Amino acid sequence: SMLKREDWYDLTRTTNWTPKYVTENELFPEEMSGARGISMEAWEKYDEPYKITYPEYVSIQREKDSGAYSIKAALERDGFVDRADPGWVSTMQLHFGAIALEEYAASTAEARMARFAKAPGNRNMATFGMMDENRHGQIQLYFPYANVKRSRKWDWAHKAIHTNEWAAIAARSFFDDMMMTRDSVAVSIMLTFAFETGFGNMQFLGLAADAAEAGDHTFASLISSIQTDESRHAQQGGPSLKILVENGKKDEAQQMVDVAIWRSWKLFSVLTGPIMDYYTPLESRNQSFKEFMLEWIVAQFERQLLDLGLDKPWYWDQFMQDLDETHHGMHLGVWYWRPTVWWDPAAGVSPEEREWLEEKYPGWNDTWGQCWDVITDNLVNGKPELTVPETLPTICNMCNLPIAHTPGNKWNVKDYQLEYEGRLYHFGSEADRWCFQIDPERYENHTNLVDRFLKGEIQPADLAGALMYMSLEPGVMGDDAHDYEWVKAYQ
């Protein structure tokens, strides 16, 4: 017969001991552990809500891959990608490029906790988390690999994070800050609590639904399978926060959460917001990016923070307001500077789409709509060259994304500059600048693409040179997803 899991589970995490041949601080360097003065005994109160053992893991995870890989093989000769909406294809090329290698990098982030967390339960769950991200990086490489012969753009599923293309820099900027250069406790909070539990979880749920709605069952199965592995390790931050709040650090925990949530939001406003309100076909939009954020992301954060004894970040109201603006700017920016990304941005401004936008965001046409009005006239009148740029946009020194905001009749574009030690920094928001000011030495000498351009690091020092610097060449450089089809409605 077999024992009940509940009978022996605890022995799997009764692994702490008192070092003798080396000191505790040597075995658990503070810069890697982040125990923050809290004793080993106090950290042993850590209790992961979702428990699992090795044999259950290899068994359940074997079946998950068997199914996901079986579905792929079955739908492979079908070539759905060949007839899929260009907006959907772009969504996937973007997804794989910005995420595949960052997924793999997350296993190192997990390994950080696996070795340096003083909480035994955290160390084991992180070992399974490490395995989870190992799977995510491999499966999200194996799937797009099937499309390499279709377009060089699919090569960016692997190549992207190895380039200095602006979007890739913004990605590494976020991920390196949240999970690769933080102590164990900090990682569990900033990565698994703030980012995975707070954004990634719901996002993959909606992405898998979108895939299905688009008729892409291979991708839908892929994403929903991956998403079921999430809670097993996204759960790690919760108990760490409980321990920090119950001991002396409530403020320290709050600050990490504030930073992580804001930085997550920014990457989300450019990689997800534009997709929901502009790339997804009008008739497939079940709700707006803002509606999605309010129902599935924002409300959850408030319940989570409340249940943890933490407060809503100082920037919460502003964040709410920005749900009406930020992503519209990130979209216009990406589309206008489309040759600089590796996928084809979908304009999404046809007459029908424009009334939807007006419905979801009252005032859109008299603000964002005006820039698009000018762009549309030029396309209608044969001046396409006025729809691409001849200069670089100003880049935020924190999120590494263009500084953009409400245009038109309610012009409200602002730059939160900061002079620090003889250098002028630019920030796209009050919160981005604050992330810099609470920890200047963490970002001080990093240079964004604009900084590099101005320092002479990009040669030739022109647009063609900047494109080469970013490893972009005809074939992968972006253009309008539907090849300006939406222009015909304006003649």
Binding site: H328, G329, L332, G333, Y336, W368, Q370, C371, D373, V374, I375, N378, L386, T387, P389, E390, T391, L392, P393, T394, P402, I403, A404, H405, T406, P407, G408, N409, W411, V413, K414, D415, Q417, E419, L424, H426, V450, F453, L454
Partner: protein
């Protein structure tokens, strides 16, 4: 040659715009307009383009030159429509 960040009125994004230290605020505004007018902003012939320091809102006379404006390299400037 001097770099400044252009925050053009009614546009949605701030942009890098190289001006000359000898440029007049008028000539600065002209260089900035190139990147916004007829790209994302409609011309306004009945108005005059003025240069304002973004951080404090200091309005620079039309005839003042970059060299005398006391700007930090990369300083952000608002390019607004005035009478």
């Amino acid at each position: 040659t001097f770099p400044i960040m252009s925050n053009f009125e009614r546009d949605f994004v701030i942009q890098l715009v190289p001006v000359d230290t000898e440029d007049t605020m008028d000539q600065v505004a002209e260089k900035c307009a190139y990147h916004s007018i007829n790209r994302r902003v409609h011309p306004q012939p009945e108005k005059i383009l003025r240069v304002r320091r973004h951080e404090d809102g200091t309005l620079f006379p039309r005839g003042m030159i970059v060299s005398d404006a006391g700007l930090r390299p990369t300083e952000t400037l608002d390019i607004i429509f005035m009478d």
